[PDB]
Short mmCIF file of C-alpha atoms and ligand atoms in Angstrom, two decimals:
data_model
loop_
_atom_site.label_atom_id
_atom_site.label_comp_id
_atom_site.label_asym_id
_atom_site.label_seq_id
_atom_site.Cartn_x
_atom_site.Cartn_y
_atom_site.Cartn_z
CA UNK A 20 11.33 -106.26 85.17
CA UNK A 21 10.24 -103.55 88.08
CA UNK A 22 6.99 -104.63 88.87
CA UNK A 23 7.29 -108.57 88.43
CA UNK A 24 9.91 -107.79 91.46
CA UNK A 25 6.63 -107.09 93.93
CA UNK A 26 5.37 -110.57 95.62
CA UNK A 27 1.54 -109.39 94.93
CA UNK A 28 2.39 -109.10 91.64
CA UNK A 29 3.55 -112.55 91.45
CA UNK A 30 0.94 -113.46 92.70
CA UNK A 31 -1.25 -111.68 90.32
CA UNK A 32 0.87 -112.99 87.53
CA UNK A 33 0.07 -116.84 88.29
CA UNK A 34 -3.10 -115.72 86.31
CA UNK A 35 -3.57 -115.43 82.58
CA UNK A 36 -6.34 -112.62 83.46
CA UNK A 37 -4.10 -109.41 82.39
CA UNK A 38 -5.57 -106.81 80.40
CA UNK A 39 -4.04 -103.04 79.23
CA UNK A 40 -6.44 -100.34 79.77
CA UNK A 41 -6.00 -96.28 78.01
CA UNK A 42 -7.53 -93.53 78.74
CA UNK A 43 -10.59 -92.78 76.62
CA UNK A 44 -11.63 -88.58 77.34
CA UNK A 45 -12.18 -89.98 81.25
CA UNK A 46 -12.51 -92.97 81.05
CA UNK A 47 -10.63 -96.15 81.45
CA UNK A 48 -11.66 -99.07 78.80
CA UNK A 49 -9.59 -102.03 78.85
CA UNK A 50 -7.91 -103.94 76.08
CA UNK A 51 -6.57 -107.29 75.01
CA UNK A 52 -3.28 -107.06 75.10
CA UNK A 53 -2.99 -109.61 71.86
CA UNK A 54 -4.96 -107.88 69.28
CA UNK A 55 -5.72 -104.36 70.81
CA UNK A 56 -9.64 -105.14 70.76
CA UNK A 57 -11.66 -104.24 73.55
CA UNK A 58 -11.68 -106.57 75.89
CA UNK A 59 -14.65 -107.69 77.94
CA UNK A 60 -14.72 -108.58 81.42
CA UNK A 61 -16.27 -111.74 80.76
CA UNK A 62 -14.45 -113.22 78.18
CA UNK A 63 -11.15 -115.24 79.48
CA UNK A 64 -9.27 -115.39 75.81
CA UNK A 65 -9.69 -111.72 75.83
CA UNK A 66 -7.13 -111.50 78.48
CA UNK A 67 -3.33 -112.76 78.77
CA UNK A 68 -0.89 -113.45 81.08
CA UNK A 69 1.25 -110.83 82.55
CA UNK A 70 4.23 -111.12 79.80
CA UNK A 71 1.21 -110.30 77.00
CA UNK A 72 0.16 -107.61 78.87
CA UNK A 73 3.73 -106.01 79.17
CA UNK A 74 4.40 -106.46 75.53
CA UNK A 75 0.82 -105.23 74.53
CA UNK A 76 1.30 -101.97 76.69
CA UNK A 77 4.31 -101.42 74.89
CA UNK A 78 2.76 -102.32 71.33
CA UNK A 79 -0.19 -100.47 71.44
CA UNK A 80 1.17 -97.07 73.78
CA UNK A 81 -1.36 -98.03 76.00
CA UNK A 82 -1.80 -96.15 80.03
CA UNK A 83 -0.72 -99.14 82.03
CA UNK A 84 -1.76 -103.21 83.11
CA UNK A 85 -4.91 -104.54 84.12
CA UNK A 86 -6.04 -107.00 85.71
CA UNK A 87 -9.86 -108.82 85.36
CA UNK A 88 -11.33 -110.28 88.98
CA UNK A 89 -13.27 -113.72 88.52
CA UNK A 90 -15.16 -115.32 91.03
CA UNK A 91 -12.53 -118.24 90.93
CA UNK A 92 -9.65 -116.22 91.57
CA UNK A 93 -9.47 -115.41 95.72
CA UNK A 94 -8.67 -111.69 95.26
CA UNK A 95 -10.61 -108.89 96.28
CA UNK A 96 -10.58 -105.63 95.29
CA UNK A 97 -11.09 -102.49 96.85
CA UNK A 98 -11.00 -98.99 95.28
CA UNK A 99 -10.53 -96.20 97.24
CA UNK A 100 -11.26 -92.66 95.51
CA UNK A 101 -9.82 -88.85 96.53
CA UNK A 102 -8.75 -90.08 99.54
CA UNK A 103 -4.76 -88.75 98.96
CA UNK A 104 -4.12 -85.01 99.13
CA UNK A 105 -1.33 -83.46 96.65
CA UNK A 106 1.27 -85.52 98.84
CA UNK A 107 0.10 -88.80 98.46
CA UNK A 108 -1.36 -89.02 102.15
CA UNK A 109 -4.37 -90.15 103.33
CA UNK A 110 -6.56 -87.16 104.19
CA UNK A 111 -9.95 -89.51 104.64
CA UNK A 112 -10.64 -90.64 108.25
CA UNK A 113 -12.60 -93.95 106.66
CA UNK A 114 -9.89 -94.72 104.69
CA UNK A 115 -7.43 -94.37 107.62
CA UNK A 116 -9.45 -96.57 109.44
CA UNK A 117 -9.61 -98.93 106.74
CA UNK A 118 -6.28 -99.15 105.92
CA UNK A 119 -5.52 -100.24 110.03
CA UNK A 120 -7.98 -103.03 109.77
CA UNK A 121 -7.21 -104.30 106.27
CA UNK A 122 -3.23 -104.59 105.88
CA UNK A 123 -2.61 -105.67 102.19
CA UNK A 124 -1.34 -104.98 99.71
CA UNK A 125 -1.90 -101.19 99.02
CA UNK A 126 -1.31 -99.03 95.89
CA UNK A 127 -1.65 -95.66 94.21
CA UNK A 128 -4.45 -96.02 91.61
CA UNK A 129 -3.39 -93.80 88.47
CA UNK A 130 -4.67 -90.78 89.21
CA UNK A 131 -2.50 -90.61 92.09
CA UNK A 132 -4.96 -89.59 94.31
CA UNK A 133 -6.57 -92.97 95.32
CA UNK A 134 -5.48 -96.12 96.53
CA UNK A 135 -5.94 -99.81 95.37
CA UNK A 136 -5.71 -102.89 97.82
CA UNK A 137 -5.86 -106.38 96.93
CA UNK A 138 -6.97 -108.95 99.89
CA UNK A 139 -7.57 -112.93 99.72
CA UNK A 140 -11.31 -113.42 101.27
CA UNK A 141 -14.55 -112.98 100.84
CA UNK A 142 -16.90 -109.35 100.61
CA UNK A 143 -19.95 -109.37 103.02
CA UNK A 144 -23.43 -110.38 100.93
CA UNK A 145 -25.12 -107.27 102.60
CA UNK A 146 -22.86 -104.53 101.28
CA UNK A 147 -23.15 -102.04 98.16
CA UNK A 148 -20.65 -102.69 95.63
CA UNK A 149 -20.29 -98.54 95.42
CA UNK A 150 -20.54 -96.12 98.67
CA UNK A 151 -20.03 -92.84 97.96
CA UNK A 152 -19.33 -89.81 101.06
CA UNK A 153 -19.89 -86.11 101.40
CA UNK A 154 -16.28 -85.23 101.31
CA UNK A 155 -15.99 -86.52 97.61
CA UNK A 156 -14.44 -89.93 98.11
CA UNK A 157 -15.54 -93.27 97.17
CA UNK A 158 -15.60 -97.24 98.44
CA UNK A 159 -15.54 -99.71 95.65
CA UNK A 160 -15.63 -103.36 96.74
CA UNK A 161 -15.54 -106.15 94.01
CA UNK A 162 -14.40 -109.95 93.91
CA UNK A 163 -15.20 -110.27 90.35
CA UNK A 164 -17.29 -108.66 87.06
CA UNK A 165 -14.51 -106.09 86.48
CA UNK A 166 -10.61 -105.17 86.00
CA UNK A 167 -8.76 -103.45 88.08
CA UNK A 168 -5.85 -101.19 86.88
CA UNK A 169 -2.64 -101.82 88.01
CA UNK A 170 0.44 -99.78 88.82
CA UNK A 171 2.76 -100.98 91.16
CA UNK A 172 3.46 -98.42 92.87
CA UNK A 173 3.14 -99.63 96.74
CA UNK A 174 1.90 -97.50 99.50
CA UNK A 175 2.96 -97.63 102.69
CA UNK A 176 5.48 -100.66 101.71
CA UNK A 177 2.09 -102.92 101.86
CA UNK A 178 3.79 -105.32 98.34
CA UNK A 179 2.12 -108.45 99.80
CA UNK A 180 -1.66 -109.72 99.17
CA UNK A 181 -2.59 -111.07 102.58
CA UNK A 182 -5.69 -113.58 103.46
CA UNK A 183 -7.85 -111.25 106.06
CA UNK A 184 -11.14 -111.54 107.19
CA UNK A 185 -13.23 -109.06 105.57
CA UNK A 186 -16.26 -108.60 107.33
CA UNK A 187 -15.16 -105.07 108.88
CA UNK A 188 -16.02 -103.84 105.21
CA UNK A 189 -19.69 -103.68 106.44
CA UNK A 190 -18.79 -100.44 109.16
CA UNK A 191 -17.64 -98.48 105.90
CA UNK A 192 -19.57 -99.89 103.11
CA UNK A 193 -23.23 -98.88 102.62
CA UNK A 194 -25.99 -101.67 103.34
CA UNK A 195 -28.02 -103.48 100.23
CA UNK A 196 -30.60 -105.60 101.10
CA UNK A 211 -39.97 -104.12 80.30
CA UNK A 212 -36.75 -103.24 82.30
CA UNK A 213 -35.97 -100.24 83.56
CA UNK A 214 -32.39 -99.85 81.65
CA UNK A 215 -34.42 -101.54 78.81
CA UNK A 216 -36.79 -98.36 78.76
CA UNK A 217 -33.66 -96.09 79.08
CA UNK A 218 -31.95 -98.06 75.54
CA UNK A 219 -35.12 -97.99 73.83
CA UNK A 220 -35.36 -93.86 74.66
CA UNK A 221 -32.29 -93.60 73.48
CA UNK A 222 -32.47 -95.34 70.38
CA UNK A 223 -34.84 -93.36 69.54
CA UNK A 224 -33.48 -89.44 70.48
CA UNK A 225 -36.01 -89.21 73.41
CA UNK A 226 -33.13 -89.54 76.03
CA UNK A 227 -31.94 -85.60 77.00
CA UNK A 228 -28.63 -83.96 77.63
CA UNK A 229 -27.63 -82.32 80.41
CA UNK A 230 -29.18 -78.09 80.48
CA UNK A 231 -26.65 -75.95 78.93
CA UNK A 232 -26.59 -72.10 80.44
CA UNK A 233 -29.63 -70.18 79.70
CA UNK A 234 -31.73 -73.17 79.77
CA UNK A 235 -34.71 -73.40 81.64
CA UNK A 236 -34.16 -76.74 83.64
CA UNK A 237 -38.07 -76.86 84.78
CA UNK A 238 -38.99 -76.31 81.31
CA UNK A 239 -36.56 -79.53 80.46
CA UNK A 240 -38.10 -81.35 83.73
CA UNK A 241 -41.25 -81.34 81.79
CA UNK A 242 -40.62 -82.00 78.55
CA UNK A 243 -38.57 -85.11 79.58
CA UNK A 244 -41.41 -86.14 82.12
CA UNK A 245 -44.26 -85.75 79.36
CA UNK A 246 -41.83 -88.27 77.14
CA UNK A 247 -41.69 -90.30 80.08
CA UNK A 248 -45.36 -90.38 80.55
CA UNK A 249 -45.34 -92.21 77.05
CA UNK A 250 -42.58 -94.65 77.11
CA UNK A 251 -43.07 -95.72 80.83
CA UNK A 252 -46.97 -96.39 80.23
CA UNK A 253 -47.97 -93.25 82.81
CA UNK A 254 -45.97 -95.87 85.25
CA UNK A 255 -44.94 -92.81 87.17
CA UNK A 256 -42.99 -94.81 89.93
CA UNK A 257 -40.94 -95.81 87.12
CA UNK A 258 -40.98 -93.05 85.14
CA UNK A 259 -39.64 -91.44 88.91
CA UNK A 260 -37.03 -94.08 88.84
CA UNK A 261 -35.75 -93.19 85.00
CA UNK A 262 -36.11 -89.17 85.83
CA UNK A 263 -33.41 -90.26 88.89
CA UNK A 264 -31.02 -91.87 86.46
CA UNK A 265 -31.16 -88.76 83.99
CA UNK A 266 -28.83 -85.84 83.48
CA UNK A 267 -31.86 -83.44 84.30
CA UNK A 268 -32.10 -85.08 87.97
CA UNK A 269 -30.96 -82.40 91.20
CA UNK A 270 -31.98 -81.81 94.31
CA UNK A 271 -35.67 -80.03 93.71
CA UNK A 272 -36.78 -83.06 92.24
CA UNK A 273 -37.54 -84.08 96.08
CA UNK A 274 -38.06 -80.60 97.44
CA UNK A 275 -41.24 -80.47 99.10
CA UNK A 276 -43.59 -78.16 97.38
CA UNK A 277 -47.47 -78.17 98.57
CA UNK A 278 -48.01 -81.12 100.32
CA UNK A 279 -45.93 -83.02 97.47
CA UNK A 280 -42.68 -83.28 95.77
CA UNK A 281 -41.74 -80.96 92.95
CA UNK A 282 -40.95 -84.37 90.93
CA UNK A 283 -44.09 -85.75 91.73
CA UNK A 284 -46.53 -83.05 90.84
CA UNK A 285 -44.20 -83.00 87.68
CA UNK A 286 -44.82 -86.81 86.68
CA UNK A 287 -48.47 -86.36 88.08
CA UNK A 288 -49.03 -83.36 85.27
CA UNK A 289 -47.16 -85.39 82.62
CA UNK A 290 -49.54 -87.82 83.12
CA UNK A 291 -52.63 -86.12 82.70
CA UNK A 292 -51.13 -83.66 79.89
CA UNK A 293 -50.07 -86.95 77.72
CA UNK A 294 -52.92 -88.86 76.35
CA UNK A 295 -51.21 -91.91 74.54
CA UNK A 296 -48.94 -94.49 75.82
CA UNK A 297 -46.44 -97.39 74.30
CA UNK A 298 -47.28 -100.33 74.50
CA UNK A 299 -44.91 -102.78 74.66
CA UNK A 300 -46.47 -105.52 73.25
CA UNK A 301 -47.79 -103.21 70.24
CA UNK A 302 -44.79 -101.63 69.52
CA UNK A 303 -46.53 -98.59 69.25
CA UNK A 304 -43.62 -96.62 68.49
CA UNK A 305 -45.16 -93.92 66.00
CA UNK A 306 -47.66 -93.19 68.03
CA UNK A 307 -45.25 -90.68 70.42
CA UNK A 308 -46.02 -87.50 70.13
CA UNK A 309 -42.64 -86.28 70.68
CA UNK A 310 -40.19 -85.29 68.31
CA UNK A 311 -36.22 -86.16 68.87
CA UNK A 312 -33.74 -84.07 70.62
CA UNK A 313 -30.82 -81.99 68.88
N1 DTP B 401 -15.07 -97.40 81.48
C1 DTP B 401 -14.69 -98.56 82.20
N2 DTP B 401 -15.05 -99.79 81.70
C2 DTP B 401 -14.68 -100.93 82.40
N3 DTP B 401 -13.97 -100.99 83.56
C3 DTP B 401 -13.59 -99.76 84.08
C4 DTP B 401 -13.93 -98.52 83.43
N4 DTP B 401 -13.40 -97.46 84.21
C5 DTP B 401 -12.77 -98.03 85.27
N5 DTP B 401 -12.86 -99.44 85.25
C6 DTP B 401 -12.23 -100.33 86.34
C7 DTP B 401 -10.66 -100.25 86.51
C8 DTP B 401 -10.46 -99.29 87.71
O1 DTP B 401 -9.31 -99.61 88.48
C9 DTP B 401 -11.70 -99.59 88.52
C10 DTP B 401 -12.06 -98.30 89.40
O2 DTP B 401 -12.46 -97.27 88.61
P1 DTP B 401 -11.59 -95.60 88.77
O3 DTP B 401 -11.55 -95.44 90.28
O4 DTP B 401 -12.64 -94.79 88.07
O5 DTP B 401 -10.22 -95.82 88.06
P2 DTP B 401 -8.60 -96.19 88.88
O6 DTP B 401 -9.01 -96.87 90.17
O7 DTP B 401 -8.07 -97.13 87.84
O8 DTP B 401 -7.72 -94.91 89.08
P3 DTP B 401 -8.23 -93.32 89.84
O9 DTP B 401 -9.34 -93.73 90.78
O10 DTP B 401 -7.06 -92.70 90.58
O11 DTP B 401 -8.71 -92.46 88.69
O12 DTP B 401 -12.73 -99.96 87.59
MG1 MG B 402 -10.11 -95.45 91.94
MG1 MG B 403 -12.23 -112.90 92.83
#
């Protein structure tokens, strides 16, 4: 009855695309409000409209409403992360400046310290969906793929979706121009994929042992095994430190290489032949 009472919400609501999302340790998974499965972003009769959702929230004690973004629908959504201070105002420069040049509708994303707005129009081709600054805070732009959480609770009085241009996102979003994440599953599937160094662990000494495991999997591929190592919990800032006339990663992956004598072959299948036991 309070919410339904914003326009952009009535907006929203023309759209059987409501989902309810909880909080799962930190994260936030959506659900279909009808059953209480998890609810993809992908699948329309996962979803409901916004009377569902309400009753769903209620029935299964869930955090709050969601809402999924399809191409078809002509919302966009932005996410804007630690950008409010304990007060609720903007502390972020960028996301001052944002706000001035994209008046919609504006809300405060659960956490409280972040802000939501919704806009009618299209996202620039060249931009990254996720830019990320030094401060802390975070620009998420998406049209569709995902859900959105949804709280009602309007910022600045901005309770209206509005149809802007929305080309000014490229002077604050960053510019864009087997499979790696099929490696990563198969590592993992089989315990070769490490944790992040607990206290008293020699992170070099993990560097290695991850790289030599690398060496295998990857197929001595070391500019992919480089691009796994970067996706890894044992990834920091010395693995690009510059360390005679080469990179601490590199002379890392280059020794891996040359210490590991086997590879896996995809096509074989070769996967007793690691030499490499599982992790803990
Ligand atoms: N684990 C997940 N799986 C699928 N979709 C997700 C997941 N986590 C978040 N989303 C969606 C809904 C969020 O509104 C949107 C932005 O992510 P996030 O900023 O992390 O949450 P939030 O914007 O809902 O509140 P806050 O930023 O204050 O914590 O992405
Ligand atoms: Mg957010
Ligand atoms: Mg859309």
């Amino acid at each position: 009855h309070m919410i339904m009472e914003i326009p952009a919400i009535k907006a929203l609501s023309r759209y059987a695309q409501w989902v309810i999302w909880k909080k799962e340790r930190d994260t936030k998974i959506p659900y279909n409000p009808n059953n209480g499965k998890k609810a993809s972003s992908t699948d329309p009769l996962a979803w409901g409209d916004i009377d569902e959702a309400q009753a769903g929230l209620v029935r299964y004690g869930a955090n709050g409403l969601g809402f999924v973004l399809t191409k078809s629908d002509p919302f966009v959504f932005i996410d804007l992360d630690h950008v409010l201070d304990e007060n609720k105002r903007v502390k972020c420069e960028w996301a001052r400046q944002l706000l001035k040049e994209i008046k919609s509708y504006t809300e405060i994303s659960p956490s409280g310290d972040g802000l939501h707005v919704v806009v009618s129009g299209k996202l620039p081709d060249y931009i990254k969906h996720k830019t990320k600054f030094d401060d802390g805070s975070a620009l998420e732009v998406y049209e569709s793929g995902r859900y959105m959480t949804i709280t009602g609770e309007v910022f600045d009085g901005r309770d209206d979706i509005k149809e802007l241009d929305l080309s000014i996102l490229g002077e604050f979003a960053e510019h864009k121009i087997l499979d790696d994440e099929a490696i990563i599953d198969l590592m993992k599937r089989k315990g070769q994929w490490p944790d992040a160094p607990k206290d008293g662990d020699d992170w070099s000494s993990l560097d290695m042992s991850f790289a030599n495991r690398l060496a295998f999997w990857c197929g001595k591929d070391i500019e992919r095994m480089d691009r796994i190592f970067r996706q890894s919990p044992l990834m920091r800032q010395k693995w690009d430190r510059p360390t005679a006339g080469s990179t601490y990663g590199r002379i890392t992956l280059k020794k891996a290489c040359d210490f590991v004598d086997s590879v896996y072959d995809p096509a074989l299948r070769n996967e007793s032949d690691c030499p490499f036991e599982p992790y803990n």
